[PDB]
Amino acid sequence: KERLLDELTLEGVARYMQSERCRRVICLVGAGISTSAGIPDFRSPSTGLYDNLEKYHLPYPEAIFEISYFKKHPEPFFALAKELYQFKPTICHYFMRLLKDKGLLLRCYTQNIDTLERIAGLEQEDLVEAHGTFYTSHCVSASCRHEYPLSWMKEKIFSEVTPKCEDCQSLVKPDIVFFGESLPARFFSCMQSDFLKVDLLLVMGTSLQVQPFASLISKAPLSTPRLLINKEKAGQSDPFLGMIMGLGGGMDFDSKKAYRDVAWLGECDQGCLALAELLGWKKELEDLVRREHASIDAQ
Amino acid sequence: RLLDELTLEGVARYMQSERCRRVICLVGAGISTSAGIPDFRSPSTGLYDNLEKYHLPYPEAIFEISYFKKHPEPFFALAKELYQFKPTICHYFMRLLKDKGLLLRCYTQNIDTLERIAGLEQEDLVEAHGTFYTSHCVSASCRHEYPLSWMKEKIFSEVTPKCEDCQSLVKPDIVFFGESLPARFFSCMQSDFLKVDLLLVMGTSLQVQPFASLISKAPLSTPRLLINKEKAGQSDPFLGMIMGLGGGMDFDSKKAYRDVAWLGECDQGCLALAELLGWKKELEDLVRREHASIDAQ
Ligand SMILES: Nc1ncnc2c1ncn2[C@@H]1O[C@H](COP(=O)(O)OP(=O)(O)OC[C@H]2O[C@H](O)[C@H](O)[C@@H]2O)[C@@H](O)[C@H]1O
Ligand SMILES: Nc1ncnc2c1ncn2[C@@H]1O[C@H](COP(=O)(O)OP(=O)(O)OC[C@H]2O[C@H](O)[C@H](O)[C@@H]2O)[C@@H](O)[C@H]1O
Ligand SMILES: [Zn+2]
Ligand SMILES: [Zn+2]
């Protein structure tokens, strides 16, 4: 339990990052880093997806990604799946690409399934897609588990055909993680190793409202500084009934005892630009975004 | 490793040793079922399966602070509909721990007061999910306290309570979803869990935070005995899990070292351990005496 930051501010963190002790950075990201791109997050008021599902007549919004409700009524999820089937990465994404190219990125653990991380240039080794992906789909039966490709899933989706296994006739779904579902093994293999020697955590665009992902901030050493770049504070709350975080497993930005957590409130993109400038990468970042976006438009 | 075998017998042997000086009990609604009080989440019998008459979006809503401010009628309806019972053998076993200087603390999620009626004192107790005894206005600015008498009159009168000052809702200090827990929970927690030699967990599903976190707060060497109808706290990780990652029980893996599950009724598990400890007759005599006294208006 050591304080490495000279001051609990973005500036202090930048200074720390340009030190030699800071070699390994883990990024923890959610849907907030993609809103600037046109993709809605989940729990933002009025705007968020969970406030926009009335037409599916769910008992509650999370039901649409809940494995039991799904097996019982899979039609809504696939309707929503086609209703929301291109986007470009954000400055946040390319800031993470920069971290990678500057040899500071041990890993990015993401809750998103938009693939903007890959598109931003991150490779699979760099990525833990904590909540799955659409690229591959599987028959839900544990015996069968027959794999099916993205082309097949699309066909079924836009063909408005509820996918079934050609073999067992069971339901087939994309390997995105539903509530009640187990997370990809890679999530666990990479976590056991990654968090033992991490020098900085960068949390961005997440409300930290789901487990086990929320536990990740607790897995880092107590000395490891943690910076949240988010429109609102997350992970900091007094203990209340139904809280997601484990007791003492959250962030401490403001208490008298606060020593390693820093909260920059605003758009992810602007926090990333600010940090870059403090680091001296602002024009390199800008040029990376203009170039990549340009190269994208050409396609 | 402190337990010689992961069995009730190994726990009893450990408890008779000199290394077991302080015991913390963690209890839930399952320790009160044998007295006629239903739990929350047991299928069909549990309360959350018996709230259809209130037409809730989900059962927990009836104890959720937001739905409550929007729709306070169902709660009070239930509050009078569920407004006497006697403590069970499990409660008196905890009283027995108290009488033998082994009980550091009992943390309870229950609000039925059978722990007090059973003979536990305020200092022995952490009522983690509050109490019906006192009631407060929901406004943080107001926070006008009201007595049990006030709340009863209002409830049995079918009168939705309002604050005399701000006209906002008034509710008993039982902890709803979204509500902060009593400060004493955290103050007692910080000190208690540095010096606990045994966790005894009874009659809870460990499905709500921050109470579920308490098992992770104990030292890694401290044995943990669950006495419950079903195994609790031991699950593979999944999206939506309540437990923090690695914060649960390990009864059955190859790496298990300290956690033991005794599956059955709480009263029978307490009788079995008592027997093992040589306290069974003393326990049965305590229960008989105190129940007799109770019957005596
Ligand atoms: N443009 C932005 N700039 C900065 N912060 C933002 C921005 N947009 C949103 N935020 C903040 O970003 C946060 C977004 O909160 P949430 O929408 O809950 O997204 P999640 O990724 O954490 O959801 C996790 C899981 O929940 C689901 O069940 C799925 O399983 C998901 O995988 C909020 O604090 C916003 O204020
Ligand atoms: N007679 C019995 N003997 C042994 N175990 C029993 C018995 N009866 C029930 N059980 C077990 O007892 C366990 C009771 O499970 P739950 O019904 O969730 O009660 P909680 O106290 O943990 O609820 C915690 C909070 O949740 C609410 O929101 C309130 O806020 C509560 O404070 C089950 O596993 C049964 O198998
Ligand atoms: Zn199949
Ligand atoms: Zn008031």
Curated annotation (Swiss-Prot), chain A:
NAD(+) binds at residues 31-35, 41-43, 111-114, 206-207, 230-232, 268. Changing residue 46 to A: Reduces deacetylase activity. Its main location: nucleus. Changing residue 215 to A: Reduces binding for the peptide inhibitor S2iL5. Changing residue 66 to A: Reduces binding for the peptide inhibitor S2iL5. Changing residue 43 to A: No effect on deacetylase activity. One of its GO terms (cellular component) is nucleus. Inhibited by Sirtinol, A3 and M15 small molecules. Inhibited by nicotinamide. Inhibited by a macrocyclic peptide inhibitor S2iL5. Inhibited by EP300-induced acetylation. This is NAD-dependent protein deacetylase sirtuin-2. The chain holds residues 55 to 355 of 389 of the full protein.
